[PDB]
């Protein structure tokens, strides 16, 4: 069959690239098809090429550590981005609590190194998420298809952010924390854009 | 003793 | 046919009866017996090596087995990959080819859909539709155009088996059974196309 | 020719599963490690995917093997003044470890049992030190190395315990207990 | 669950170790037991236990089989009138005689202690009569004679070891079985030393 005719060096194509392409396929049908076909063809003609691609990617992880950290640090500029232009206390509250969370998350790369001070930063972030959620539900009941969908997503990514911290105190790989923090900043922004309309 | 006497003569 | 045992093998086996050596008999002997029918030389040599190794150091087989069970996540990962790989393949025959490619495609993506319950449930519905559409084209070609009869019956048997496996997974949580099963159903899809060839 | 030399994907479990096992074994048993590895290499090269078939037939028997491992631990019970002391304190440890499957599903009793184990180990360990510091046996640092081996596996048992509280997988504790029982048995054989 | 372990742990080894006596029967019975066990899980264990419960009957039979192994059987009898050959016929007669009476002396410490001393003497004296007879054969043609002497010496050690285990066990069947093998061996001595002569 196909398992016997395929060389062991080609396994990365199926263990790493295929699952990536499969998840992409839910979002963009053609992009995954084009990329998968290119990798398939490339692997067939040169077995081990995927593995070499992946190894060269892992080699350049530092670039990627620097990149995600940058994007997190730079988010401080975009802290007042997406303020809802409405003169009402609940909406004034929603802007402020979102502002504070995005600001606090953009401070992570500074507090991350000393784990002692980082611990007393975890408290502040959690306190900010909680206080944003308390304001999210305040607006919802005074102002479902796509309305609650964003709130659901926020919860998922906030706990995903928390589970990332526990893995950090076991890895020391701040990149995972940078990545999730950024996702939460984007998730915070999607909330503010929902109430814009 | 008779137990060992066999093994000695067999070896 | 059947494995032969040497005087030395016979002697050793008779001298290894302590409880710690029972996995050699309860686990390895049934394996050798099933291996015997297909690969006589391998089964012969492997039993011979196990017998001797166990004779001189009781507990060895149990050690080996427990170390294999320890490495379960490697085998799950490997089986996941084998599955993802398994799909790499008159207008009436074109209709049959496309809809067989479609089934193998969905099935190979199981390792990446099973994680989310909503996504896996849709995947299960998609699998059901793929089988309907494939069998419809099979009933179509048999009426338009004969040692291809039994493969249809075998496809159903493995289709129905895969169904019962899903239900067992929702009870167990062991996703390995579903991957092995799906890979068998992909092979049955290949056997059908081979008979027309 | 060329394709016969290049390893197929379906042979990976030989390298991902069997080789680490044989490499770990080679330390304590060279001949067994060599012959089995040779057997598996011979087998795999002749019929690729065979090693994978074996692995799957063994995982198929997971629960049987899990039940047997516990069973082996429950049976561990059945197996000069200072040498009598050495025999007694080895017997104590094995008997208490053999009780694990009765105490494991009781978090209160299990902690008591772990404490009893901790005590029984220490008592056996200084007993060993007493026989060495009163006789000096004909054996060399072979006893000393065997002591080091026992201590290694004794802490291995402890690390398995801390993992157990996080994942719940009791089988690993049975396996570790069984290894600890074997290590104490090797102590006795070296001392005889 | 393995209500089926005894098939592999007892019956398989039993058949494996009887292959040199007969191969086809060992195979057909294996297959018989395997089929029976698969149709009836736990049957092999129930059978094994019912055999083990017939310990009395089997001891009685093994006693009889030993008692009967002695009486001068009309086959092995060296025709040569030479004193050395005649001394061989009778020293074997004495050994076969003494070994055959074990069943009726073993259940008495004092008498059996005497019997063990006599068996030892009977063996030693046979070894002497075998050593004395070597000179009657062309010295460049004693391969079989020497080989048969060694095999007899092996089974004599085997009987001595069996006799050692008896005082720790108390299990007489081992003695009987071992003693019967030894008789068969002294018969092979007579058979070999009759064929070359």
UniProtKB/Swiss-Prot annotation, chain C:
Location, primary (coarse class): cytoplasm
Cross-link (Glycyl lysine isopeptide (Lys-Gly) (interchain with G-Cter in SUMO2)): 174
MF-aspect GO terms: protein homodimerization activity; protein kinase binding
Family annotation (Pfam families): PDC10_C, PDCD10_N
Membrane protein topology class: Peripheral membrane protein
Keyword terms of this UniProt record: Acetylation, Angiogenesis, Apoptosis, Cell membrane, Cytoplasm, Golgi apparatus, Isopeptide bond, Membrane, Ubl conjugation
Disease: Cerebral cavernous malformations 3: A form of cerebral cavernous malformations, a congenital vascular anomaly of the central nervous system that can result in hemorrhagic stroke, seizures, recurrent headaches, and focal neurologic deficits. The lesions are characterized by grossly enlarged blood vessels consisting of a single layer of endothelium and without any intervening neural tissue, ranging in diameter from a few millimeters to several centimeters. CCM3 inheritance is autosomal dominant.
Protein family: Belongs to the PDCD10 family.
Subunit (UniProt): Homodimer. Interacts (via C-terminus) with CCM2. Interacts (via C-terminus) with PXN. Interacts (via N-terminus) with STK25. Interacts (via N-terminus) with STK26. Interacts (via N-terminus) with STK24. Interacts with GOLGA2. Identified in a complex with KRIT1 and CCM2. Interacts with KDR/VEGFR2. Interaction with KDR/VEGFR2 is enhanced by stimulation with VEGFA. Interacts with RIPOR1 (via C-terminus); this interaction is required for the association of RIPOR1 with either STK24 and STK26 kinases and occurs in a Rho-independent manner.
Role this protein plays: Promotes cell proliferation. Modulates apoptotic pathways. Increases mitogen-activated protein kinase activity and STK26 activity. Important for cell migration, and for normal structure and assembly of the Golgi complex. Part of the striatin-interacting phosphatase and kinase (STRIPAK) complexes. STRIPAK complexes have critical roles in protein (de)phosphorylation and are regulators of multiple signaling pathways including Hippo, MAPK, nuclear receptor and cytoskeleton remodeling.
Entry protein name: Programmed cell death protein 10
Natural source organism: Homo sapiens
Curated annotation (Swiss-Prot), chain E:
The name this protein goes by in its record: Programmed cell death protein 10
Consequence the record notes for mutating residue 157 to D: Loss of interaction with CCM2 and PXN
General function of this protein: Promotes cell proliferation. Modulates apoptotic pathways. Increases mitogen-activated protein kinase activity and STK26 activity. Important for cell migration, and for normal structure and assembly of the Golgi complex. Part of the striatin-interacting phosphatase and kinase (STRIPAK) complexes. STRIPAK complexes have critical roles in protein (de)phosphorylation and are regulators of multiple signaling pathways including Hippo, MAPK, nuclear receptor and cytoskeleton remodeling.
GO molecular function: protein homodimerization activity; protein kinase binding
Organism: Homo sapiens
One Pfam family it belongs to: PDC10_C
Disease: Cerebral cavernous malformations 3: A form of cerebral cavernous malformations, a congenital vascular anomaly of the central nervous system that can result in hemorrhagic stroke, seizures, recurrent headaches, and focal neurologic deficits. The lesions are characterized by grossly enlarged blood vessels consisting of a single layer of endothelium and without any intervening neural tissue, ranging in diameter from a few millimeters to several centimeters. CCM3 inheritance is autosomal dominant.
Subunit composition and interactions: Homodimer. Interacts (via C-terminus) with CCM2. Interacts (via C-terminus) with PXN. Interacts (via N-terminus) with STK25. Interacts (via N-terminus) with STK26. Interacts (via N-terminus) with STK24. Interacts with GOLGA2. Identified in a complex with KRIT1 and CCM2. Interacts with KDR/VEGFR2. Interaction with KDR/VEGFR2 is enhanced by stimulation with VEGFA. Interacts with RIPOR1 (via C-terminus); this interaction is required for the association of RIPOR1 with either STK24 and STK26 kinases and occurs in a Rho-independent manner.
């Amino acid at each position: 069959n196909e398992a016997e005719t395929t060389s062991m060096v080609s396994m990365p194509l199926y263990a790493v690239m295929y699952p990536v392409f499969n998840e992409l396929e839910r979002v963009n049908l053609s992009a995954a098809q084009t990329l998968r076909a290119a990798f398939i063809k490339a692997e067939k003609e040169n077995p081990g090429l995927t593995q070499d691609i992946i190894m060269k990617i892992l080699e350049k992880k530092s670039v990627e550590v620097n990149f995600t950290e940058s994007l997190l640090r730079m988010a401080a500029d975009d802290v007042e981005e997406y303020m809802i232009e409405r003169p009402e206390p609940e909406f004034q509250d929603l802007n402020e609590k979102a502002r504070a969370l995005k600001q606090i998350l953009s401070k992570i790369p500074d507090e991350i190194n000393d784990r002692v001070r980082f611990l007393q930063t975890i408290k502040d972030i959690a306190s900010a998420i909680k206080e944003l959620l308390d304001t999210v539900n305040n607006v919802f009941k005074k102002y479902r298809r796509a309305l609650e969908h964003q709130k659901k997503e926020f919860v998922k990514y906030s706990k995903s952010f928390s589970d990332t911290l526990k893995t950090y105190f076991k890895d020391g790989k701040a990149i995972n924390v940078f990545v999730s923090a950024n996702r939460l900043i984007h998730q915070t922004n999607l909330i503010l854009q929902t109430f814009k309309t | 003793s008779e137990l060992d006497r066999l093994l000695l003569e067999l070896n």
